JSON list of C-alpha atoms and ligand atoms in Angstrom, two decimals:
[
{"chain": "A", "resi": 1, "resn": "UNK", "atom": "CA", "xyz": [33.65, 43.85, 54.71]},
{"chain": "A", "resi": 2, "resn": "UNK", "atom": "CA", "xyz": [31.51, 41.34, 57.41]},
{"chain": "A", "resi": 3, "resn": "UNK", "atom": "CA", "xyz": [31.31, 38.43, 54.83]},
{"chain": "A", "resi": 4, "resn": "UNK", "atom": "CA", "xyz": [34.97, 38.84, 53.48]},
{"chain": "A", "resi": 5, "resn": "UNK", "atom": "CA", "xyz": [35.86, 38.52, 56.79]},
{"chain": "A", "resi": 6, "resn": "UNK", "atom": "CA", "xyz": [34.80, 35.60, 57.62]},
{"chain": "A", "resi": 7, "resn": "UNK", "atom": "CA", "xyz": [37.16, 32.91, 59.53]},
{"chain": "A", "resi": 8, "resn": "UNK", "atom": "CA", "xyz": [37.38, 29.38, 57.40]},
{"chain": "A", "resi": 9, "resn": "UNK", "atom": "CA", "xyz": [37.02, 26.92, 60.97]},
{"chain": "A", "resi": 10, "resn": "UNK", "atom": "CA", "xyz": [40.13, 24.46, 60.42]},
{"chain": "A", "resi": 11, "resn": "UNK", "atom": "CA", "xyz": [41.26, 20.47, 59.93]},
{"chain": "A", "resi": 12, "resn": "UNK", "atom": "CA", "xyz": [41.27, 17.68, 62.48]},
{"chain": "A", "resi": 13, "resn": "UNK", "atom": "CA", "xyz": [45.31, 17.46, 62.47]},
{"chain": "A", "resi": 14, "resn": "UNK", "atom": "CA", "xyz": [47.58, 13.96, 62.96]},
{"chain": "A", "resi": 15, "resn": "UNK", "atom": "CA", "xyz": [50.06, 15.89, 65.66]},
{"chain": "A", "resi": 16, "resn": "UNK", "atom": "CA", "xyz": [51.13, 11.88, 66.44]},
{"chain": "A", "resi": 17, "resn": "UNK", "atom": "CA", "xyz": [50.10, 8.28, 67.33]},
{"chain": "A", "resi": 18, "resn": "UNK", "atom": "CA", "xyz": [50.19, 5.80, 69.64]},
{"chain": "A", "resi": 19, "resn": "UNK", "atom": "CA", "xyz": [51.73, 2.78, 69.06]},
{"chain": "A", "resi": 20, "resn": "UNK", "atom": "CA", "xyz": [50.52, -0.28, 69.96]},
{"chain": "A", "resi": 21, "resn": "UNK", "atom": "CA", "xyz": [52.61, -2.29, 67.14]},
{"chain": "A", "resi": 22, "resn": "UNK", "atom": "CA", "xyz": [55.12, -4.07, 69.49]},
{"chain": "A", "resi": 23, "resn": "UNK", "atom": "CA", "xyz": [55.29, -5.52, 73.21]},
{"chain": "A", "resi": 24, "resn": "UNK", "atom": "CA", "xyz": [55.09, -1.83, 74.46]},
{"chain": "A", "resi": 25, "resn": "UNK", "atom": "CA", "xyz": [53.26, 0.91, 73.71]},
{"chain": "A", "resi": 26, "resn": "UNK", "atom": "CA", "xyz": [54.02, 4.47, 73.80]},
{"chain": "A", "resi": 27, "resn": "UNK", "atom": "CA", "xyz": [53.62, 7.63, 72.30]},
{"chain": "A", "resi": 28, "resn": "UNK", "atom": "CA", "xyz": [54.60, 9.77, 69.40]},
{"chain": "A", "resi": 29, "resn": "UNK", "atom": "CA", "xyz": [54.56, 13.12, 68.70]},
{"chain": "A", "resi": 30, "resn": "UNK", "atom": "CA", "xyz": [54.52, 13.93, 64.50]},
{"chain": "A", "resi": 31, "resn": "UNK", "atom": "CA", "xyz": [54.16, 17.78, 64.68]},
{"chain": "A", "resi": 32, "resn": "UNK", "atom": "CA", "xyz": [54.61, 20.34, 67.07]},
{"chain": "A", "resi": 33, "resn": "UNK", "atom": "CA", "xyz": [52.24, 22.79, 67.84]},
{"chain": "A", "resi": 34, "resn": "UNK", "atom": "CA", "xyz": [52.67, 25.37, 65.15]},
{"chain": "A", "resi": 35, "resn": "UNK", "atom": "CA", "xyz": [52.90, 23.26, 61.97]},
{"chain": "A", "resi": 36, "resn": "UNK", "atom": "CA", "xyz": [49.66, 21.66, 63.13]},
{"chain": "A", "resi": 37, "resn": "UNK", "atom": "CA", "xyz": [47.80, 24.91, 63.40]},
{"chain": "A", "resi": 38, "resn": "UNK", "atom": "CA", "xyz": [49.56, 25.82, 60.09]},
{"chain": "A", "resi": 39, "resn": "UNK", "atom": "CA", "xyz": [48.31, 22.29, 58.43]},
{"chain": "A", "resi": 40, "resn": "UNK", "atom": "CA", "xyz": [44.80, 22.44, 60.09]},
{"chain": "A", "resi": 41, "resn": "UNK", "atom": "CA", "xyz": [44.19, 26.43, 58.07]},
{"chain": "A", "resi": 42, "resn": "UNK", "atom": "CA", "xyz": [45.34, 24.68, 54.90]},
{"chain": "A", "resi": 43, "resn": "UNK", "atom": "CA", "xyz": [43.77, 21.16, 55.36]},
{"chain": "A", "resi": 44, "resn": "UNK", "atom": "CA", "xyz": [47.40, 19.72, 53.34]},
{"chain": "A", "resi": 45, "resn": "UNK", "atom": "CA", "xyz": [49.39, 17.22, 56.26]},
{"chain": "A", "resi": 46, "resn": "UNK", "atom": "CA", "xyz": [52.26, 15.42, 53.90]},
{"chain": "A", "resi": 47, "resn": "UNK", "atom": "CA", "xyz": [53.40, 13.77, 57.01]},
{"chain": "A", "resi": 48, "resn": "UNK", "atom": "CA", "xyz": [52.79, 9.97, 56.06]},
{"chain": "A", "resi": 49, "resn": "UNK", "atom": "CA", "xyz": [50.91, 8.36, 58.87]},
{"chain": "A", "resi": 50, "resn": "UNK", "atom": "CA", "xyz": [51.42, 5.31, 60.24]},
{"chain": "A", "resi": 51, "resn": "UNK", "atom": "CA", "xyz": [49.31, 2.76, 62.52]},
{"chain": "A", "resi": 52, "resn": "UNK", "atom": "CA", "xyz": [46.10, 2.55, 63.55]},
{"chain": "A", "resi": 53, "resn": "UNK", "atom": "CA", "xyz": [45.76, 5.15, 66.60]},
{"chain": "A", "resi": 54, "resn": "UNK", "atom": "CA", "xyz": [45.85, 8.62, 66.03]},
{"chain": "A", "resi": 55, "resn": "UNK", "atom": "CA", "xyz": [46.65, 11.65, 68.23]},
{"chain": "A", "resi": 56, "resn": "UNK", "atom": "CA", "xyz": [44.67, 14.82, 66.79]},
{"chain": "A", "resi": 57, "resn": "UNK", "atom": "CA", "xyz": [43.91, 17.94, 67.18]},
{"chain": "A", "resi": 58, "resn": "UNK", "atom": "CA", "xyz": [42.14, 20.61, 66.65]},
{"chain": "A", "resi": 59, "resn": "UNK", "atom": "CA", "xyz": [43.02, 24.63, 66.60]},
{"chain": "A", "resi": 60, "resn": "UNK", "atom": "CA", "xyz": [41.43, 23.97, 70.47]},
{"chain": "A", "resi": 61, "resn": "UNK", "atom": "CA", "xyz": [40.94, 20.58, 71.96]},
{"chain": "A", "resi": 62, "resn": "UNK", "atom": "CA", "xyz": [43.07, 17.59, 71.22]},
{"chain": "A", "resi": 63, "resn": "UNK", "atom": "CA", "xyz": [42.09, 13.99, 71.41]},
{"chain": "A", "resi": 64, "resn": "UNK", "atom": "CA", "xyz": [42.71, 10.37, 69.54]},
{"chain": "A", "resi": 65, "resn": "UNK", "atom": "CA", "xyz": [41.25, 8.10, 66.89]},
{"chain": "A", "resi": 66, "resn": "UNK", "atom": "CA", "xyz": [41.19, 5.00, 65.93]},
{"chain": "A", "resi": 67, "resn": "UNK", "atom": "CA", "xyz": [40.81, 3.47, 62.64]},
{"chain": "A", "resi": 68, "resn": "UNK", "atom": "CA", "xyz": [38.01, -0.35, 62.23]},
{"chain": "A", "resi": 69, "resn": "UNK", "atom": "CA", "xyz": [37.07, -1.64, 59.52]},
{"chain": "A", "resi": 70, "resn": "UNK", "atom": "CA", "xyz": [38.95, 1.15, 56.79]},
{"chain": "A", "resi": 71, "resn": "UNK", "atom": "CA", "xyz": [37.47, 4.49, 58.98]},
{"chain": "A", "resi": 72, "resn": "UNK", "atom": "CA", "xyz": [39.43, 7.06, 61.00]},
{"chain": "A", "resi": 73, "resn": "UNK", "atom": "CA", "xyz": [36.99, 7.35, 63.86]},
{"chain": "A", "resi": 74, "resn": "UNK", "atom": "CA", "xyz": [36.70, 9.71, 66.43]},
{"chain": "A", "resi": 75, "resn": "UNK", "atom": "CA", "xyz": [34.19, 11.95, 69.16]},
{"chain": "A", "resi": 76, "resn": "UNK", "atom": "CA", "xyz": [31.86, 14.58, 67.60]},
{"chain": "A", "resi": 77, "resn": "UNK", "atom": "CA", "xyz": [32.63, 16.76, 70.82]},
{"chain": "A", "resi": 78, "resn": "UNK", "atom": "CA", "xyz": [36.01, 16.48, 70.01]},
{"chain": "A", "resi": 79, "resn": "UNK", "atom": "CA", "xyz": [35.62, 17.00, 65.78]},
{"chain": "A", "resi": 80, "resn": "UNK", "atom": "CA", "xyz": [32.39, 18.76, 65.23]},
{"chain": "A", "resi": 81, "resn": "UNK", "atom": "CA", "xyz": [31.75, 18.35, 61.20]},
{"chain": "A", "resi": 82, "resn": "UNK", "atom": "CA", "xyz": [35.74, 18.87, 60.61]},
{"chain": "A", "resi": 83, "resn": "UNK", "atom": "CA", "xyz": [37.05, 17.73, 57.86]},
{"chain": "A", "resi": 84, "resn": "UNK", "atom": "CA", "xyz": [40.80, 16.04, 58.68]},
{"chain": "A", "resi": 85, "resn": "UNK", "atom": "CA", "xyz": [44.06, 17.90, 56.53]},
{"chain": "A", "resi": 86, "resn": "UNK", "atom": "CA", "xyz": [45.17, 15.31, 54.44]},
{"chain": "A", "resi": 87, "resn": "UNK", "atom": "CA", "xyz": [48.19, 15.16, 51.07]},
{"chain": "A", "resi": 88, "resn": "UNK", "atom": "CA", "xyz": [45.33, 15.90, 48.80]},
{"chain": "A", "resi": 89, "resn": "UNK", "atom": "CA", "xyz": [43.65, 18.18, 51.36]},
{"chain": "A", "resi": 90, "resn": "UNK", "atom": "CA", "xyz": [40.92, 18.15, 53.40]},
{"chain": "A", "resi": 91, "resn": "UNK", "atom": "CA", "xyz": [39.13, 15.42, 53.21]},
{"chain": "A", "resi": 92, "resn": "UNK", "atom": "CA", "xyz": [35.32, 15.51, 54.34]},
{"chain": "A", "resi": 93, "resn": "UNK", "atom": "CA", "xyz": [34.39, 13.70, 56.72]},
{"chain": "A", "resi": 94, "resn": "UNK", "atom": "CA", "xyz": [32.02, 9.89, 55.30]},
{"chain": "A", "resi": 95, "resn": "UNK", "atom": "CA", "xyz": [30.08, 9.24, 58.54]},
{"chain": "A", "resi": 96, "resn": "UNK", "atom": "CA", "xyz": [28.83, 12.09, 60.64]},
{"chain": "A", "resi": 97, "resn": "UNK", "atom": "CA", "xyz": [26.14, 10.31, 64.22]},
{"chain": "A", "resi": 98, "resn": "UNK", "atom": "CA", "xyz": [25.85, 12.92, 66.53]},
{"chain": "A", "resi": 99, "resn": "UNK", "atom": "CA", "xyz": [23.76, 11.33, 68.40]},
{"chain": "A", "resi": 100, "resn": "UNK", "atom": "CA", "xyz": [25.91, 8.42, 68.47]},
{"chain": "A", "resi": 101, "resn": "UNK", "atom": "CA", "xyz": [29.43, 11.57, 68.97]},
{"chain": "A", "resi": 102, "resn": "UNK", "atom": "CA", "xyz": [30.86, 9.39, 66.23]},
{"chain": "A", "resi": 103, "resn": "UNK", "atom": "CA", "xyz": [31.96, 10.47, 63.20]},
{"chain": "A", "resi": 104, "resn": "UNK", "atom": "CA", "xyz": [34.28, 8.89, 60.40]},
{"chain": "A", "resi": 105, "resn": "UNK", "atom": "CA", "xyz": [37.16, 9.95, 57.85]},
{"chain": "A", "resi": 106, "resn": "UNK", "atom": "CA", "xyz": [38.30, 6.92, 55.44]},
{"chain": "A", "resi": 107, "resn": "UNK", "atom": "CA", "xyz": [41.25, 5.98, 57.23]},
{"chain": "A", "resi": 108, "resn": "UNK", "atom": "CA", "xyz": [44.37, 7.25, 55.93]},
{"chain": "A", "resi": 109, "resn": "UNK", "atom": "CA", "xyz": [46.87, 5.69, 53.45]},
{"chain": "A", "resi": 110, "resn": "UNK", "atom": "CA", "xyz": [48.66, 4.36, 55.30]},
{"chain": "A", "resi": 111, "resn": "UNK", "atom": "CA", "xyz": [47.29, 3.42, 57.79]},
{"chain": "A", "resi": 112, "resn": "UNK", "atom": "CA", "xyz": [46.40, 0.31, 59.02]},
{"chain": "A", "resi": 113, "resn": "UNK", "atom": "CA", "xyz": [42.76, -1.24, 61.14]},
{"chain": "A", "resi": 114, "resn": "UNK", "atom": "CA", "xyz": [42.04, -2.89, 64.61]},
{"chain": "A", "resi": 115, "resn": "UNK", "atom": "CA", "xyz": [40.52, -5.66, 63.70]},
{"chain": "A", "resi": 116, "resn": "UNK", "atom": "CA", "xyz": [36.72, -5.54, 65.93]},
{"chain": "A", "resi": 117, "resn": "UNK", "atom": "CA", "xyz": [36.42, -8.16, 69.02]},
{"chain": "A", "resi": 118, "resn": "UNK", "atom": "CA", "xyz": [34.32, -11.18, 68.52]},
{"chain": "A", "resi": 119, "resn": "UNK", "atom": "CA", "xyz": [35.10, -12.78, 71.99]},
{"chain": "A", "resi": 120, "resn": "UNK", "atom": "CA", "xyz": [32.61, -11.63, 74.18]},
{"chain": "A", "resi": 121, "resn": "UNK", "atom": "CA", "xyz": [34.85, -10.83, 76.24]},
{"chain": "A", "resi": 122, "resn": "UNK", "atom": "CA", "xyz": [35.13, -9.16, 79.89]},
{"chain": "A", "resi": 123, "resn": "UNK", "atom": "CA", "xyz": [38.02, -7.44, 80.51]},
{"chain": "A", "resi": 124, "resn": "UNK", "atom": "CA", "xyz": [38.98, -4.85, 78.62]},
{"chain": "A", "resi": 125, "resn": "UNK", "atom": "CA", "xyz": [41.86, -2.16, 78.47]},
{"chain": "A", "resi": 126, "resn": "UNK", "atom": "CA", "xyz": [41.64, 1.66, 77.73]},
{"chain": "A", "resi": 127, "resn": "UNK", "atom": "CA", "xyz": [44.11, 2.92, 76.01]},
{"chain": "A", "resi": 128, "resn": "UNK", "atom": "CA", "xyz": [45.12, 6.09, 76.68]},
{"chain": "A", "resi": 129, "resn": "UNK", "atom": "CA", "xyz": [46.71, 9.25, 74.84]},
{"chain": "A", "resi": 130, "resn": "UNK", "atom": "CA", "xyz": [49.70, 8.41, 77.60]},
{"chain": "A", "resi": 131, "resn": "UNK", "atom": "CA", "xyz": [49.91, 5.43, 76.16]},
{"chain": "A", "resi": 132, "resn": "UNK", "atom": "CA", "xyz": [49.10, 3.76, 79.18]},
{"chain": "A", "resi": 133, "resn": "UNK", "atom": "CA", "xyz": [46.34, 1.00, 79.13]},
{"chain": "A", "resi": 134, "resn": "UNK", "atom": "CA", "xyz": [43.84, 0.33, 82.11]},
{"chain": "A", "resi": 135, "resn": "UNK", "atom": "CA", "xyz": [42.31, -2.65, 82.40]},
{"chain": "A", "resi": 136, "resn": "UNK", "atom": "CA", "xyz": [38.09, -1.98, 82.54]},
{"chain": "A", "resi": 137, "resn": "UNK", "atom": "CA", "xyz": [35.61, -4.91, 83.90]},
{"chain": "A", "resi": 138, "resn": "UNK", "atom": "CA", "xyz": [33.13, -4.96, 81.41]},
{"chain": "A", "resi": 139, "resn": "UNK", "atom": "CA", "xyz": [29.13, -3.98, 81.93]},
{"chain": "A", "resi": 140, "resn": "UNK", "atom": "CA", "xyz": [27.11, -4.09, 78.79]},
{"chain": "A", "resi": 141, "resn": "UNK", "atom": "CA", "xyz": [27.37, -3.43, 75.48]},
{"chain": "A", "resi": 142, "resn": "UNK", "atom": "CA", "xyz": [28.68, -0.04, 76.29]},
{"chain": "A", "resi": 143, "resn": "UNK", "atom": "CA", "xyz": [29.52, 0.41, 79.71]},
{"chain": "A", "resi": 144, "resn": "UNK", "atom": "CA", "xyz": [32.99, -0.51, 81.79]},
{"chain": "A", "resi": 145, "resn": "UNK", "atom": "CA", "xyz": [33.90, 0.07, 85.31]},
{"chain": "A", "resi": 146, "resn": "UNK", "atom": "CA", "xyz": [38.03, 0.93, 86.17]},
{"chain": "A", "resi": 147, "resn": "UNK", "atom": "CA", "xyz": [39.28, -1.30, 88.32]},
{"chain": "A", "resi": 148, "resn": "UNK", "atom": "CA", "xyz": [41.39, 0.74, 90.53]},
{"chain": "A", "resi": 149, "resn": "UNK", "atom": "CA", "xyz": [41.09, 4.59, 91.21]},
{"chain": "A", "resi": 150, "resn": "UNK", "atom": "CA", "xyz": [42.73, 7.02, 89.56]},
{"chain": "A", "resi": 151, "resn": "UNK", "atom": "CA", "xyz": [42.33, 10.74, 89.16]},
{"chain": "A", "resi": 152, "resn": "UNK", "atom": "CA", "xyz": [39.98, 11.70, 85.88]},
{"chain": "A", "resi": 153, "resn": "UNK", "atom": "CA", "xyz": [42.49, 14.06, 85.09]},
{"chain": "A", "resi": 154, "resn": "UNK", "atom": "CA", "xyz": [44.53, 10.66, 83.99]},
{"chain": "A", "resi": 155, "resn": "UNK", "atom": "CA", "xyz": [41.69, 9.96, 81.25]},
{"chain": "A", "resi": 156, "resn": "UNK", "atom": "CA", "xyz": [41.03, 13.60, 80.10]},
{"chain": "A", "resi": 157, "resn": "UNK", "atom": "CA", "xyz": [41.77, 13.75, 75.85]},
{"chain": "A", "resi": 158, "resn": "UNK", "atom": "CA", "xyz": [41.96, 9.89, 75.39]},
{"chain": "A", "resi": 159, "resn": "UNK", "atom": "CA", "xyz": [37.88, 9.70, 74.07]},
{"chain": "A", "resi": 160, "resn": "UNK", "atom": "CA", "xyz": [39.02, 8.58, 70.15]},
{"chain": "A", "resi": 161, "resn": "UNK", "atom": "CA", "xyz": [41.36, 5.72, 71.82]},
{"chain": "A", "resi": 162, "resn": "UNK", "atom": "CA", "xyz": [40.04, 1.91, 71.64]},
{"chain": "A", "resi": 163, "resn": "UNK", "atom": "CA", "xyz": [38.58, -0.44, 74.49]},
{"chain": "A", "resi": 164, "resn": "UNK", "atom": "CA", "xyz": [40.44, -3.37, 73.20]},
{"chain": "A", "resi": 165, "resn": "UNK", "atom": "CA", "xyz": [39.80, -7.24, 74.41]},
{"chain": "A", "resi": 166, "resn": "UNK", "atom": "CA", "xyz": [42.75, -8.85, 75.59]},
{"chain": "A", "resi": 167, "resn": "UNK", "atom": "CA", "xyz": [43.69, -10.16, 72.50]},
{"chain": "A", "resi": 168, "resn": "UNK", "atom": "CA", "xyz": [43.86, -6.86, 71.09]},
{"chain": "A", "resi": 169, "resn": "UNK", "atom": "CA", "xyz": [41.19, -6.55, 68.93]},
{"chain": "A", "resi": 170, "resn": "UNK", "atom": "CA", "xyz": [38.74, -3.53, 69.29]},
{"chain": "A", "resi": 171, "resn": "UNK", "atom": "CA", "xyz": [35.64, -3.41, 71.78]},
{"chain": "A", "resi": 172, "resn": "UNK", "atom": "CA", "xyz": [34.76, 0.05, 71.21]},
{"chain": "A", "resi": 173, "resn": "UNK", "atom": "CA", "xyz": [36.44, 3.91, 71.40]},
{"chain": "A", "resi": 174, "resn": "UNK", "atom": "CA", "xyz": [36.54, 5.51, 74.66]},
{"chain": "A", "resi": 175, "resn": "UNK", "atom": "CA", "xyz": [33.61, 8.21, 74.90]},
{"chain": "A", "resi": 176, "resn": "UNK", "atom": "CA", "xyz": [33.24, 9.35, 78.37]},
{"chain": "A", "resi": 177, "resn": "UNK", "atom": "CA", "xyz": [33.37, 9.15, 81.80]},
{"chain": "A", "resi": 178, "resn": "UNK", "atom": "CA", "xyz": [32.16, 9.12, 85.09]},
{"chain": "A", "resi": 179, "resn": "UNK", "atom": "CA", "xyz": [33.87, 10.16, 88.57]},
{"chain": "A", "resi": 180, "resn": "UNK", "atom": "CA", "xyz": [32.74, 10.45, 91.75]},
{"chain": "A", "resi": 181, "resn": "UNK", "atom": "CA", "xyz": [35.02, 13.20, 93.80]},
{"chain": "A", "resi": 182, "resn": "UNK", "atom": "CA", "xyz": [37.19, 13.56, 91.10]},
{"chain": "A", "resi": 183, "resn": "UNK", "atom": "CA", "xyz": [38.14, 9.22, 91.30]},
{"chain": "A", "resi": 184, "resn": "UNK", "atom": "CA", "xyz": [37.12, 8.05, 87.45]},
{"chain": "A", "resi": 185, "resn": "UNK", "atom": "CA", "xyz": [35.31, 5.08, 88.15]},
{"chain": "A", "resi": 186, "resn": "UNK", "atom": "CA", "xyz": [33.44, 3.66, 84.78]},
{"chain": "A", "resi": 187, "resn": "UNK", "atom": "CA", "xyz": [34.01, 3.90, 81.26]},
{"chain": "A", "resi": 188, "resn": "UNK", "atom": "CA", "xyz": [31.27, 4.84, 78.63]},
{"chain": "A", "resi": 189, "resn": "UNK", "atom": "CA", "xyz": [31.94, 3.33, 74.58]},
{"chain": "A", "resi": 190, "resn": "UNK", "atom": "CA", "xyz": [30.37, 3.49, 71.32]},
{"chain": "A", "resi": 191, "resn": "UNK", "atom": "CA", "xyz": [30.78, -0.05, 70.30]},
{"chain": "A", "resi": 192, "resn": "UNK", "atom": "CA", "xyz": [32.17, -1.93, 67.71]},
{"chain": "A", "resi": 193, "resn": "UNK", "atom": "CA", "xyz": [29.09, -2.96, 65.75]},
{"chain": "A", "resi": 194, "resn": "UNK", "atom": "CA", "xyz": [28.59, 0.86, 65.65]},
{"chain": "A", "resi": 195, "resn": "UNK", "atom": "CA", "xyz": [32.50, 1.40, 64.29]},
{"chain": "A", "resi": 196, "resn": "UNK", "atom": "CA", "xyz": [31.38, 0.54, 60.82]},
{"chain": "A", "resi": 197, "resn": "UNK", "atom": "CA", "xyz": [29.95, 1.55, 57.46]},
{"chain": "B", "resi": 201, "resn": "LIG", "atom": "C1", "xyz": [28.55, 18.51, 70.79]},
{"chain": "B", "resi": 201, "resn": "LIG", "atom": "O1", "xyz": [27.90, 17.32, 70.46]},
{"chain": "B", "resi": 201, "resn": "LIG", "atom": "C2", "xyz": [28.53, 16.61, 71.41]},
{"chain": "B", "resi": 201, "resn": "LIG", "atom": "C3", "xyz": [27.23, 15.45, 71.01]},
{"chain": "B", "resi": 201, "resn": "LIG", "atom": "C4", "xyz": [27.27, 14.24, 71.51]},
{"chain": "B", "resi": 201, "resn": "LIG", "atom": "C5", "xyz": [27.94, 14.29, 73.26]},
{"chain": "B", "resi": 201, "resn": "LIG", "atom": "N1", "xyz": [27.68, 12.54, 73.55]},
{"chain": "B", "resi": 201, "resn": "LIG", "atom": "C6", "xyz": [29.18, 12.84, 75.21]},
{"chain": "B", "resi": 201, "resn": "LIG", "atom": "C7", "xyz": [28.25, 11.86, 75.94]},
{"chain": "B", "resi": 201, "resn": "LIG", "atom": "C8", "xyz": [28.71, 14.01, 75.10]},
{"chain": "B", "resi": 201, "resn": "LIG", "atom": "O2", "xyz": [29.99, 13.94, 77.08]},
{"chain": "B", "resi": 201, "resn": "LIG", "atom": "C9", "xyz": [31.05, 15.38, 77.20]},
{"chain": "B", "resi": 201, "resn": "LIG", "atom": "C10", "xyz": [32.42, 14.97, 76.40]},
{"chain": "B", "resi": 201, "resn": "LIG", "atom": "C11", "xyz": [33.17, 13.80, 76.98]},
{"chain": "B", "resi": 201, "resn": "LIG", "atom": "C12", "xyz": [33.97, 13.31, 77.36]},
{"chain": "B", "resi": 201, "resn": "LIG", "atom": "O3", "xyz": [35.05, 14.66, 78.25]},
{"chain": "B", "resi": 201, "resn": "LIG", "atom": "N2", "xyz": [34.94, 12.65, 76.92]},
{"chain": "B", "resi": 201, "resn": "LIG", "atom": "C13", "xyz": [36.41, 12.43, 77.50]},
{"chain": "B", "resi": 201, "resn": "LIG", "atom": "C14", "xyz": [37.32, 13.02, 76.85]},
{"chain": "B", "resi": 201, "resn": "LIG", "atom": "O4", "xyz": [38.57, 12.62, 76.90]},
{"chain": "B", "resi": 201, "resn": "LIG", "atom": "N3", "xyz": [37.11, 13.84, 76.02]},
{"chain": "B", "resi": 201, "resn": "LIG", "atom": "S1", "xyz": [38.68, 14.59, 75.23]},
{"chain": "B", "resi": 201, "resn": "LIG", "atom": "O5", "xyz": [39.28, 14.35, 74.34]},
{"chain": "B", "resi": 201, "resn": "LIG", "atom": "O6", "xyz": [39.18, 14.79, 76.51]},
{"chain": "B", "resi": 201, "resn": "LIG", "atom": "C15", "xyz": [37.23, 16.13, 74.25]},
{"chain": "B", "resi": 201, "resn": "LIG", "atom": "C16", "xyz": [36.20, 17.00, 75.26]},
{"chain": "B", "resi": 201, "resn": "LIG", "atom": "C17", "xyz": [37.52, 16.09, 72.75]},
{"chain": "B", "resi": 201, "resn": "LIG", "atom": "C18", "xyz": [38.36, 16.91, 74.11]},
{"chain": "B", "resi": 201, "resn": "LIG", "atom": "C19", "xyz": [36.52, 10.92, 77.55]},
{"chain": "B", "resi": 201, "resn": "LIG", "atom": "C20", "xyz": [35.93, 11.81, 78.71]},
{"chain": "B", "resi": 201, "resn": "LIG", "atom": "C21", "xyz": [37.72, 11.84, 79.81]},
{"chain": "B", "resi": 201, "resn": "LIG", "atom": "C22", "xyz": [37.25, 12.21, 80.78]},
{"chain": "B", "resi": 201, "resn": "LIG", "atom": "C23", "xyz": [35.54, 12.96, 81.33]},
{"chain": "B", "resi": 201, "resn": "LIG", "atom": "C24", "xyz": [36.10, 14.36, 81.95]},
{"chain": "B", "resi": 201, "resn": "LIG", "atom": "C25", "xyz": [34.45, 15.27, 82.35]},
{"chain": "B", "resi": 201, "resn": "LIG", "atom": "C26", "xyz": [33.50, 14.82, 81.69]},
{"chain": "B", "resi": 201, "resn": "LIG", "atom": "C27", "xyz": [32.34, 13.51, 82.41]},
{"chain": "B", "resi": 201, "resn": "LIG", "atom": "C28", "xyz": [31.45, 13.37, 80.55]},
{"chain": "B", "resi": 201, "resn": "LIG", "atom": "N4", "xyz": [31.06, 12.55, 81.74]},
{"chain": "B", "resi": 201, "resn": "LIG", "atom": "C29", "xyz": [29.34, 11.47, 80.79]},
{"chain": "B", "resi": 201, "resn": "LIG", "atom": "O7", "xyz": [28.63, 12.67, 79.58]},
{"chain": "B", "resi": 201, "resn": "LIG", "atom": "O8", "xyz": [29.25, 10.93, 81.53]},
{"chain": "B", "resi": 201, "resn": "LIG", "atom": "C30", "xyz": [27.77, 10.17, 80.72]},
{"chain": "B", "resi": 201, "resn": "LIG", "atom": "C31", "xyz": [26.87, 10.76, 80.93]},
{"chain": "B", "resi": 201, "resn": "LIG", "atom": "C32", "xyz": [26.52, 9.42, 82.49]},
{"chain": "B", "resi": 201, "resn": "LIG", "atom": "C33", "xyz": [26.83, 8.18, 81.47]},
{"chain": "B", "resi": 201, "resn": "LIG", "atom": "C34", "xyz": [28.02, 8.80, 80.36]},
{"chain": "B", "resi": 201, "resn": "LIG", "atom": "F1", "xyz": [27.98, 8.10, 79.44]},
{"chain": "B", "resi": 201, "resn": "LIG", "atom": "C35", "xyz": [32.40, 13.02, 79.89]},
{"chain": "B", "resi": 201, "resn": "LIG", "atom": "O9", "xyz": [33.05, 12.53, 79.26]},
{"chain": "B", "resi": 201, "resn": "LIG", "atom": "N5", "xyz": [31.87, 14.02, 78.36]},
{"chain": "B", "resi": 201, "resn": "LIG", "atom": "C36", "xyz": [30.81, 14.83, 78.49]},
{"chain": "B", "resi": 201, "resn": "LIG", "atom": "N6", "xyz": [29.41, 15.15, 75.10]},
{"chain": "B", "resi": 201, "resn": "LIG", "atom": "C37", "xyz": [29.00, 15.00, 73.47]},
{"chain": "B", "resi": 201, "resn": "LIG", "atom": "C38", "xyz": [28.55, 16.30, 72.60]},
{"chain": "B", "resi": 202, "resn": "LIG", "atom": "ZN1", "xyz": [38.85, -9.43, 70.37]}
]
């Protein structure tokens, strides 16, 4: 029938991480494509989670998610209303605010949270899904300028990742980017004051 044939939307799945625990940032893959698709459909992820910044995927998109204040945060435009796969099955969001482009799930067991930044620094560092660390000069509360011209493609897929201060605290999570003739010029982020329940 029509209703028998209705497909169920799958879960966000953790497929990797951006390791920030030593003197060198680097990306790690923890699931390949077939395992991602299977875990999206079941909602059951028995991998052990580590760290603060996760690489996440749906059936159709990949982006980042960052734990702050005991919640794994990402962008609504990547995750929508989806559950996240976990060792106990799919986990429903505990925070959803489309108006901030923001969602959150309770942080996975075994993860760690970044500390909110209280520095008021304007020297920021954007962490990409390739573990590039991009200097950004803060312009107000939710925005920053890129110091050096990079093609916008270098930033695609990095929404949900952190902006860090010089001390490595979280200033916000990356939401959107502004470019001119293909060159990324500025970034827009969800400030950390909002990354709390
Ligand atoms: C559906 O419900 C909602 C609700 C709220 C909501 N809110 C916003 C802001 C929103 O924006 C969408 C998504 C976001 C995006 O692509 N995000 C990044 C990413 O990487 N995503 S991603 O991981 O590839 C992806 C797609 C998840 C997998 C970080 C960029 C990287 C590259 C940019 C590429 C070209 C696009 C340039 C856009 N620029 C822009 O909007 O600039 C704004 C307007 C001017 C000022 C500034 F704030 C931009 O960045 N966009 C446009 N969608 C929604 C949708
Ligand atoms: Zn700080």
